[PDB]
């Protein structure tokens, strides 16, 4: 890059006030119904959230053991923001290498560990379960049929994007971006800390963001500098962070960190979710970095609402019986 990341962490110009600090027991369905989840939320503690996390001294090797030593993972080259691939055993080997000996900066932010031993060790904030489209919209018998622990597309039976394990070494940086499908994000710092640059998804900023992508000079321009309002917020250990749909953010890792989080679509900001999808469309984002079965999920959402309200089903007879069979469990 050409810009100085160091000063971007020192300056006080990113003093916008977007984030809201909340109590877990205040984060319920009624709150989403009142606000539509438009504001970034931070929970300084876990009380009331209903989350479950592994042992506080959980290691990367423990992650390997739970997902498999030969599990292929998507690794990010920090310097180029490109993507490479190695086994969890190789990644663990790199992560366990002393800080001053690492030949390069690598970042793992895309380890989806659903349907592994790690799955039941980590639990989403309870409220997310009530609104997540995957848990409430997608056909249940399809999701329950999932056996593959990797995100291979041919074996994927549903949007497998609910549980991610992020492992970052000190110095890791993720440039500005909007999570796929315009999904909202829950972000829990298990060990370490993160530094976030936040940008509101206004019409002007989304346009600025898109042109910034097509520009190709994303490594020559700090996006937080050419918007009117940006906030740099530091996330500490034990913190839970909820990112609303469409929010442009970059992230820095001031120390070796272990994060558990996930994405989700909900019914309270569909327009913005569709906005972000079209941006992905126009910027030619490869399908591998996008929300799987996006439009299929959208079709299923319409069916659920129509049925839950008018009692008229638009599923096939076979799909209706599949659901009816599960209602009798």
């Amino acid at each position: 890059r050409t810009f100085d990341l160091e000063e971007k962490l020192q300056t006080n110009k990113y003093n916008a006030n977007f984030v809201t600090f909340m109590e877990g027991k205040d984060f319920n369905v009624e709150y989403i119904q009142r606000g539509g989840l438009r504001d970034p939320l931070i929970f300084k503690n876990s009380d009331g959230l209903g989350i479950k996390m592994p042992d506080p001294d959980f290691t990367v090797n423990d992650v390997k053991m739970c997902v498999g030593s030969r599990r292929m993972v998507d690794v990010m080259d920090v310097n180029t923001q490109k993507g490479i691939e190695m086994t969890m055993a190789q990644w663990t080997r790199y992560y366990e290498t002393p800080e001053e000996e690492r030949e390069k900066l690598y970042n793992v932010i895309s380890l989806e560990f659903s349907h592994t031993r790690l799955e039941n060790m980590v639990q989403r904030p309870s409220t997310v379960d009530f609104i997540d489209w995957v848990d409430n919209m997608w056909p249940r018998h399809l999701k329950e049929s999932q056996t593959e622990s990797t995100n291979a597309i041919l074996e994927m039976q549903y949007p497998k994007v609910q549980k991610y394990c992020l492992m970052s070494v000190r110095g890791c940086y993720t440039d500005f971006h909007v999570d796929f499908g315009g999904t909202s994000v829950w972000y829990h710092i298990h060990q370490g800390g993160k530094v976030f640059w936040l940008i509101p998804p206004t019409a002007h900023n989304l346009e600025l963001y898109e042109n910034w992508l097509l520009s190709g000079k994303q490594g020559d321009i700090f996006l937080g500098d050419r918007v009117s309002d940006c906030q740099r917020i530091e996330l500490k250990q034990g913190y839970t962070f909820v990112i609303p749909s469409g929010w442009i953010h970059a992230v820095y890792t001031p120390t070796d960190t272990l994060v558990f989080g996930g994405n989700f679509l909900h019914s309270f900001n569909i327009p913005m979710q569709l906005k972000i999808y079209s941006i992905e469309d126009r910027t030619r984002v490869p399908n591998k970095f996008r929300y799987p079965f996006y439009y299929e999920m959208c079709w299923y959402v319409l069916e659920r609402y129509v049925y839950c309200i008018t009692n008229r089903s638009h599923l096939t007879k076979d799909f209706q019986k599949e659901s009816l069979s599960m209602d009798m469990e």
Binding site: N151, N287, P292
Partner: peptide, 10 residues
């Protein structure tokens, strides 16, 4: 080269 999806990367 098995195809994948839902990968998080900027």
């Amino acid at each position: 080269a098995p195809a994948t999806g839902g990968v998080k990367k900027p």
